[PDB]
Amino acid sequence: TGPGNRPLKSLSDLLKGKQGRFRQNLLGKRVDYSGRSVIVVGPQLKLHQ
Amino acid sequence: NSVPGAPNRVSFAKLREPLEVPGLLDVQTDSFEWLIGSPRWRESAAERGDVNPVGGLEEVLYELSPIEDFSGSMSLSFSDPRFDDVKAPVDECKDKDMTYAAPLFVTAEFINNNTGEIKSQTVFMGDFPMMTEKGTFIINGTERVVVSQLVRSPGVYFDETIDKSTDKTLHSVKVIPSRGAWLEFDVDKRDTVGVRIDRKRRQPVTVLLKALGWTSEQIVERFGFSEIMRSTLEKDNTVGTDEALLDIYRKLRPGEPPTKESAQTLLENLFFKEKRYDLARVGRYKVNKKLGLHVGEPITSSTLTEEDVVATIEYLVRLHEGQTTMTVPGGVEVPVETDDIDHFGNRRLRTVGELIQNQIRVGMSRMERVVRERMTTQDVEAITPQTLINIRPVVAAIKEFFGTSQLSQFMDQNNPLSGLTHKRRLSALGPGGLSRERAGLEVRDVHPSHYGRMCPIETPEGPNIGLIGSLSVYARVNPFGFIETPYRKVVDGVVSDEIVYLTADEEDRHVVAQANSPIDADGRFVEPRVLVRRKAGEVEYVPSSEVDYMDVSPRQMVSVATAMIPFLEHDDANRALMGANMQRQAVPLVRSEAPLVGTGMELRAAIDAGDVVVAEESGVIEEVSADYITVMHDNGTRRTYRMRKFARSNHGTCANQCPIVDAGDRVEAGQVIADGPCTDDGEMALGKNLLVAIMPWEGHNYEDAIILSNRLVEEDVLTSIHIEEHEIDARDTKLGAEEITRDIPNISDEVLADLDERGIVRIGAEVRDGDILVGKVTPKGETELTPEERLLRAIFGEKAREVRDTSLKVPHGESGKVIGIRVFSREDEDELPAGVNELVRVYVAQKRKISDGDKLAGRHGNKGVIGKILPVEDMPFLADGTPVDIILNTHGVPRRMNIGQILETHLGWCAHSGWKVDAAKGVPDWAARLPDELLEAQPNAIVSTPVFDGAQEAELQGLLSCTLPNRDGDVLVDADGKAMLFDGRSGEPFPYPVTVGYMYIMKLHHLVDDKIHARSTGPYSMITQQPLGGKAQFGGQRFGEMECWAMQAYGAAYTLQELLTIKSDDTVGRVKVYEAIVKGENIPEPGIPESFKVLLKELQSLCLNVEVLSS
Amino acid sequence: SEALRQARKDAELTASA
């Protein structure tokens, strides 16, 4: 127990994958060196561009 | 009409509704005032009976008083929950961040039962928050919104799931009370009783009856036709009351010695001692009403009665008997039938004051269980309730409720519309409410009782559909948490004119046809065979004698936002809901023009919207200003009205208020005086009115791709204001006190230019991302310098300045002037949090032009991103040289089922054009029943249509036939709504006429800059080694499971390895690669991952022999 | 009569730990 109505976490719970009885989404580390944005058409552009 | 500043918008009302719009905010006002118990509410509830007007607080007093020791030697009591005035004005409370509240005084009294002496005090219960006049609350200056949560009430709940394995209906009941225990009267597979109770696993009814003081004689007497009853009483296999009592006691406390007095002294406490087993008063009401038991008396005594249980059993057995209705002795016959958890008749509504009282009860519980604690430990004949009182837990609960609650949420003020929409919101998830996955999909469904009560259209389209909606417009609330709905009762083939606020249950009793009915001008009707809603929610041609209630009006099943899309009955609910939820995402432009076309909603919406200042008293104007207006009340008295100008919303949008009148003017009470942001001429305004064609042009309008002329840009027609606030504190470290100043560590001078004299920058200065905001500094401590740095200092004569440079710089992608500086200082006696001494907050605005990529959408769900900002000249345009505004793609129209936008476009062209229908040879037939003075139209006059009462296409065609020329002899559009156009690029006319017209559109709160973001290298983790995610900081994009497995599919491995090593975990390798890039050299090899080794150590420390073998 | 299945289960939840 502690304060804050909320359970505990052994070493067993620090397991990254730790899939028990269900194969949830995976959700690893969110790498680097990208950029996001909304997308738009390039109708003037070539295919490879 | 019926509005003073109502700008003349003609509409197409073919009907006439008796009642007008209600007070949309009453949903919150009334709950709040009742919880208050204000005399407003006092007369209010008194208007419809309500012999005992009791406030929720009064209820809490009566449910708490008296307060007495278990010995019963001494007695405490309360009285007069009395509010004190608020400690500060709402504006001041918001600005200085003091939560707008007010004290609480109670006439509490203690008396010693031993001898009897009054201890009356008027106790400060605590400062108590006060609702806004916009029905909201300000916490610490912050502005939240409470939500009303849907819950099916506690009640006697019936069902017979047929055991198909037995092929037998299994009638059952679960009477779930508040603060109580459960119980089942089950139709077992055998001809027996499912008398499992309080989660016990099983009982015979006979055990209850003899336990209830009933002989088998008494039972068969009371239950002669009771077949399973007689069977079980033959199989009761136990005789005598106390035998049943002891069996119950042992099976209830198994692992416990049975005692005889616990026979009555447990069950009566379990189910009749109304101190630990108490469904709500509304629960008792539902009980009697379902059962007609307490027919003519007010509700009380949440404890049960054997009367209740026996009527229960009788109805249950008869339901599993073949029955229609049974009148209990003392009760009218209730129709024998099941129950529904989904149907509103069980699904009540915990209101705001409801939840507040719940918190009050839970706090006062703890407080009384400590008062009774001290009640003995307190010294006798020397205490006072002041000595007895602790308001700390109660105030704690209050605070932790206003803050720290998914029902106490931030008012999304992006515009008056969505502000309103946030209120009047309906959700069943929450504390007590079901969580997300625990609810079955069926609760998301649209039960036919929903009709006219909860608009089936408006709801979040994410993974919460069906979980949250809003109210129908003309809906109204039961004091018991139900939907009391007005209805037009018809009598004798003649609709009366008496509005009838009805719930859903009684509705099932009755017969309601449709408002769109051929009424014979008098309540009399036209045809016999009439549509009508069935008690099963079904429709037929009733012969026109049978109905007793007609619809109050059309659109009684619409939401607010849903009430604001013309032609709505022509397009699919899908794009409908899409545009609906989007329309709350509108963004207030700076010009705020009103649409040519609309509904009747656009004015009432604002007049409840509030943010548009309303004329309080009728009067002549005194003097105006850009910031306020002096108002001459008609007799002497006067007043000002402080315009809110450039007030930062909860989303960076401006909140100006411009006045709309003159100081020599004279207006009337309840009248518009100054539009708010999205308000134009008093009514709503969420965009502009634009002429568009629909061709596929150059592919640039490909798959929702949306093109734009430069003309709007250079005309500022799409122009947003944004208000980003920055704040930083003056803490104090072990190294000393944080410092703010122009004095800096190593830094340029020009970078120290636009600061003030004492750190912070100067008002009105332009800025750009990374620039310095505030010159702040703290000591860093002491470490041995590098010999190199020491050398640079030596050659350069440069001091140490161990105080570290900790200033405020603007984050990325930000610019615009700084309007106002908000500064706080502990030295100034500014109250600040501990470990702080000075606070400053900054306000920058940037007049964002419209730009490509941003998301626009009409009022149809028809939406999309900005394809490309094209110049004006290179544009398809009229024969009058008038360029088009934008172009949409036809191909999205059919498959989306959104012809209403086409309707709107034709209508808007007609509206801009103006007509004058030649009623020279009588009237053209389509115009026959059409309202007069539509026979012409001044160009660019404003009009509107009721949702279900809109113009017909034939009407529109007859209009479009009448399309008087603009300036010259100029019928620019055919009778088919198309026209010939010219490519500003080609030079030629296009081969065909083209659909065109004026459409009103919005701008969404999803600007490009809000989303655009990239990154190479930034601040690495603390737990892991990893440079921070989150676009608030840099952040970036997570390359996880989908395109890994993918890259493997491609077969390319090295890129994946590089990503997962040198962009993921290799501490040394990261700087290595950075070096290699800086030097222009071949990449180093990917080192070992870090989380790998971390997991390795973990597995080790799990007491696990672990090891790799290289060979 | 067949309701006793909880009896085997109810015994093990309680004295548990």
Ligand SMILES: C/C=C/C/C=C(\C)[C@H](O)CC/C(C)=C/C=C(C)/C(O)=C1/C(=O)C=C([C@H](C)CC/C=C/NC(=O)OC)OC1=O
């Ligand atoms: C030392 C290993 C002991 C046994 C493994 C245990 C206990 C783990 O519990 C399961 C393996 C695992 C998950 C560890 C996660 C770690 C070390 C970590 O922090 C991550 C992470 O969370 C995600 C990733 C990648 C992005 C996962 C990509 C998977 C691709 N799979 C595939 O290519 O399909 C064939 O790497 C990590 O090092």
